[PDB]
Design a protein around this motif. Structure first.
Motif, PDB file in Angstrom:
ATOM      1  N   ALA A   1       0.837  -1.193   0.000  1.00  0.00           N
ATOM      2  CA  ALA A   1       0.000   0.000   0.000  1.00  0.00           C
ATOM      3  C   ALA A   1       0.873   1.243   0.000  1.00  0.00           C
ATOM      4  O   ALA A   1       0.703   2.155   0.811  1.00  0.00           O
ATOM      5  N   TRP A   2       1.840   1.276  -0.916  1.00  0.00           N
ATOM      6  CA  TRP A   2       2.842   2.333  -0.932  1.00  0.00           C
ATOM      7  C   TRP A   2       2.193   3.708  -0.996  1.00  0.00           C
ATOM      8  O   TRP A   2       1.198   3.913  -1.693  1.00  0.00           O
ATOM      9  N   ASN A   3       2.753   4.649  -0.244  1.00  0.00           N
ATOM     10  CA  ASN A   3       2.156   5.972  -0.154  1.00  0.00           C
ATOM     11  C   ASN A   3       2.557   6.824  -1.349  1.00  0.00           C
ATOM     12  O   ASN A   3       3.722   6.840  -1.755  1.00  0.00           O
ATOM     13  N   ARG A   4       1.581   7.552  -1.892  1.00  0.00           N
ATOM     14  CA  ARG A   4       1.728   8.344  -3.105  1.00  0.00           C
ATOM     15  C   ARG A   4       1.315   9.782  -2.833  1.00  0.00           C
ATOM     16  O   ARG A   4       0.253  10.029  -2.257  1.00  0.00           O
ATOM     17  N   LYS A   5       2.153  10.729  -3.245  1.00  0.00           N
ATOM     18  CA  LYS A   5       1.840  12.142  -3.094  1.00  0.00           C
ATOM     19  C   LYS A   5       2.268  12.908  -4.338  1.00  0.00           C
ATOM     20  O   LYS A   5       3.197  12.512  -5.046  1.00  0.00           O
ATOM     21  N   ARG A   6       1.572  14.011  -4.596  1.00  0.00           N
ATOM     22  CA  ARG A   6       1.844  14.887  -5.726  1.00  0.00           C
ATOM     23  C   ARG A   6       2.244  16.261  -5.211  1.00  0.00           C
ATOM     24  O   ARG A   6       1.634  16.778  -4.270  1.00  0.00           O
ATOM     25  N   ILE A   7       3.267  16.847  -5.827  1.00  0.00           N
ATOM     26  CA  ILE A   7       3.816  18.129  -5.406  1.00  0.00           C
ATOM     27  C   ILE A   7       3.909  19.044  -6.618  1.00  0.00           C
ATOM     28  O   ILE A   7       4.385  18.628  -7.680  1.00  0.00           O
ATOM     29  N   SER A   8       3.455  20.284  -6.454  1.00  0.00           N
ATOM     30  CA  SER A   8       3.562  21.297  -7.491  1.00  0.00           C
ATOM     31  C   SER A   8       3.561  22.668  -6.835  1.00  0.00           C
ATOM     32  O   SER A   8       3.230  22.813  -5.656  1.00  0.00           O
ATOM     33  N   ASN A   9       3.947  23.675  -7.619  1.00  0.00           N
ATOM     34  CA  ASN A   9       3.971  25.065  -7.170  1.00  0.00           C
ATOM     35  C   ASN A   9       4.867  25.224  -5.941  1.00  0.00           C
ATOM     36  O   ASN A   9       4.416  25.533  -4.838  1.00  0.00           O
ATOM     37  N   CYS A  10       6.158  24.983  -6.152  1.00  0.00           N
ATOM     38  CA  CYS A  10       7.118  25.045  -5.062  1.00  0.00           C
ATOM     39  C   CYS A  10       8.510  25.258  -5.634  1.00  0.00           C
ATOM     40  O   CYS A  10       8.753  25.049  -6.825  1.00  0.00           O
ATOM     41  N   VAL A  11       9.420  25.681  -4.763  1.00  0.00           N
ATOM     42  CA  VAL A  11      10.833  25.814  -5.088  1.00  0.00           C
ATOM     43  C   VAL A  11      11.558  24.679  -4.382  1.00  0.00           C
ATOM     44  O   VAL A  11      11.726  24.705  -3.156  1.00  0.00           O
ATOM     45  N   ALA A  12      11.992  23.685  -5.148  1.00  0.00           N
ATOM     46  CA  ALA A  12      12.596  22.481  -4.596  1.00  0.00           C
ATOM     47  C   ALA A  12      14.111  22.613  -4.630  1.00  0.00           C
ATOM     48  O   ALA A  12      14.704  22.735  -5.707  1.00  0.00           O
ATOM     49  N   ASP A  13      14.732  22.580  -3.455  1.00  0.00           N
ATOM     50  CA  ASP A  13      16.183  22.648  -3.331  1.00  0.00           C
ATOM     51  C   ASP A  13      16.710  21.231  -3.165  1.00  0.00           C
ATOM     52  O   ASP A  13      16.451  20.578  -2.150  1.00  0.00           O
ATOM     53  N   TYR A  14      17.450  20.759  -4.161  1.00  0.00           N
ATOM     54  CA  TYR A  14      18.010  19.418  -4.130  1.00  0.00           C
ATOM     55  C   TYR A  14      19.406  19.374  -3.531  1.00  0.00           C
ATOM     56  O   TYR A  14      19.942  18.280  -3.328  1.00  0.00           O
ATOM     57  N   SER A  15      20.005  20.531  -3.249  1.00  0.00           N
ATOM     58  CA  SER A  15      21.317  20.542  -2.614  1.00  0.00           C
ATOM     59  C   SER A  15      21.257  19.919  -1.228  1.00  0.00           C
ATOM     60  O   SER A  15      22.122  19.115  -0.862  1.00  0.00           O
ATOM     61  N   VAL A  16      20.228  20.264  -0.449  1.00  0.00           N
ATOM     62  CA  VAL A  16      20.096  19.746   0.907  1.00  0.00           C
ATOM     63  C   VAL A  16      19.926  18.240   0.947  1.00  0.00           C
ATOM     64  O   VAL A  16      20.112  17.632   2.006  1.00  0.00           O
ATOM     65  N   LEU A  17      19.570  17.622  -0.174  1.00  0.00           N
ATOM     66  CA  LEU A  17      19.483  16.172  -0.228  1.00  0.00           C
ATOM     67  C   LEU A  17      20.798  15.540  -0.654  1.00  0.00           C
ATOM     68  O   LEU A  17      21.199  14.510  -0.103  1.00  0.00           O
ATOM     69  N   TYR A  18      21.480  16.139  -1.629  1.00  0.00           N
ATOM     70  CA  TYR A  18      22.713  15.546  -2.126  1.00  0.00           C
ATOM     71  C   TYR A  18      23.825  15.626  -1.087  1.00  0.00           C
ATOM     72  O   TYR A  18      24.587  14.669  -0.913  1.00  0.00           O
ATOM     73  N   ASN A  19      23.930  16.756  -0.386  1.00  0.00           N
ATOM     74  CA  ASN A  19      25.028  16.938   0.557  1.00  0.00           C
ATOM     75  C   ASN A  19      24.894  16.032   1.773  1.00  0.00           C
ATOM     76  O   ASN A  19      25.903  15.686   2.397  1.00  0.00           O
ATOM     77  N   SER A  20      23.669  15.650   2.130  1.00  0.00           N
ATOM     78  CA  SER A  20      23.450  14.857   3.332  1.00  0.00           C
ATOM     79  C   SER A  20      24.175  13.521   3.242  1.00  0.00           C
ATOM     80  O   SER A  20      24.153  12.855   2.204  1.00  0.00           O
ATOM     81  N   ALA A  21      24.817  13.132   4.342  1.00  0.00           N
ATOM     82  CA  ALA A  21      25.577  11.892   4.416  1.00  0.00           C
ATOM     83  C   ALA A  21      24.763  10.753   5.014  1.00  0.00           C
ATOM     84  O   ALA A  21      25.323   9.864   5.664  1.00  0.00           O
ATOM     85  N   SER A  22      23.448  10.762   4.807  1.00  0.00           N
ATOM     86  CA  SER A  22      22.571   9.781   5.429  1.00  0.00           C
ATOM     87  C   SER A  22      22.006   8.760   4.453  1.00  0.00           C
ATOM     88  O   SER A  22      21.584   7.683   4.889  1.00  0.00           O
ATOM     89  N   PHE A  23      21.985   9.062   3.161  1.00  0.00           N
ATOM     90  CA  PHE A  23      21.356   8.194   2.177  1.00  0.00           C
ATOM     91  C   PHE A  23      22.388   7.236   1.603  1.00  0.00           C
ATOM     92  O   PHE A  23      23.352   7.663   0.960  1.00  0.00           O
ATOM     93  N   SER A  24      22.184   5.940   1.840  1.00  0.00           N
ATOM     94  CA  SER A  24      23.087   4.939   1.289  1.00  0.00           C
ATOM     95  C   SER A  24      22.961   4.859  -0.225  1.00  0.00           C
ATOM     96  O   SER A  24      23.967   4.860  -0.942  1.00  0.00           O
ATOM     97  N   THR A  25      21.734   4.792  -0.730  1.00  0.00           N
ATOM     98  CA  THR A  25      21.486   4.660  -2.159  1.00  0.00           C
ATOM     99  C   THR A  25      20.805   5.919  -2.671  1.00  0.00           C
ATOM    100  O   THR A  25      19.711   6.268  -2.212  1.00  0.00           O
ATOM    101  N   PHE A  26      21.447   6.584  -3.629  1.00  0.00           N
ATOM    102  CA  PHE A  26      20.948   7.815  -4.245  1.00  0.00           C
ATOM    103  C   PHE A  26      21.230   7.654  -5.735  1.00  0.00           C
ATOM    104  O   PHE A  26      22.306   8.026  -6.209  1.00  0.00           O
ATOM    105  N   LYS A  27      20.276   7.093  -6.472  1.00  0.00           N
ATOM    106  CA  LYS A  27      20.517   6.750  -7.869  1.00  0.00           C
ATOM    107  C   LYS A  27      19.422   7.352  -8.733  1.00  0.00           C
ATOM    108  O   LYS A  27      18.257   6.964  -8.626  1.00  0.00           O
ATOM    109  N   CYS A  28      19.788   8.299  -9.582  1.00  0.00           N
ATOM    110  CA  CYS A  28      18.836   8.934 -10.474  1.00  0.00           C
ATOM    111  C   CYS A  28      19.017   8.387 -11.883  1.00  0.00           C
ATOM    112  O   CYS A  28      20.127   8.044 -12.295  1.00  0.00           O
ATOM    113  N   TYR A  29      17.912   8.301 -12.619  1.00  0.00           N
ATOM    114  CA  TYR A  29      17.897   7.600 -13.895  1.00  0.00           C
ATOM    115  C   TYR A  29      17.765   8.544 -15.083  1.00  0.00           C
ATOM    116  O   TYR A  29      18.588   8.501 -16.001  1.00  0.00           O
ATOM    117  N   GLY A  30      16.737   9.393 -15.098  1.00  0.00           N
ATOM    118  CA  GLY A  30      16.512  10.242 -16.251  1.00  0.00           C
ATOM    119  C   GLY A  30      17.582  11.285 -16.475  1.00  0.00           C
ATOM    120  O   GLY A  30      17.999  11.510 -17.615  1.00  0.00           O
TER     121      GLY A  30
END
Lengths: 99, 50
Positions: A6-35
């Motif tokens: 029952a995986w949770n699904r959400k939709r996001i729009s109308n926002c300023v998304a900062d991806y730096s705060v995710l890449y710099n974090s040393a907590s994610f073991s797997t961070f693999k982007c495809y497109g």
């Protein structure tokens, strides 16, 4: 979180998304982007972003990939072969485990 | 008396009276007739970094 069947699904729009705060974090073991290249994520503007969240076993992170076969892939969550986006996975033994 | 520290996973068995290993004979030796108790738990999230 929610279970995989029952995986949770959400939709996001109308926002300023900062991806730096995710890449710099040393907590994610797997961070693999495809497109696209992750380092260029700040350089693109989108709309209608989809976020799926759930919890799985350690060995099954490998099955979250386009063109993958197993048990979760073909019974709980299937990825389009032409998927574009990114996948994040990390460890939660501290909070989701009990003696 | 309370003593606190952090070690690996395989080494918790070394913390016992009359035990042999590396930590026991070089970092922390229990008396053979020790009285009291021992508590160990996992702290992977706090003490590990990618």
């Amino acid at each position: 979180f929610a279970s995989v069947y029952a995986w949770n699904r959400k939709r996001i729009s109308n926002c300023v998304a900062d991806y730096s705060v995710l890449y710099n974090s040393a907590s994610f073991s797997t961070f693999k982007c495809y497109g696209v290249s992750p380092t260029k994520l700040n350089d693109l503007c989108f709309t209608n972003v989809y976020a799926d969240s759930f919890v799985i076993r350690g060995d099954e992170v490998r099955q979250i990939a386009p063109g993958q076969t197993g048990k979760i892939a073909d019974y709980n969550y299937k990825l389009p072969d032409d998927f574009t986006g990114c996948v994040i996975a990390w460890n939660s033994n501290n909070l989701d485990s009990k003696v």
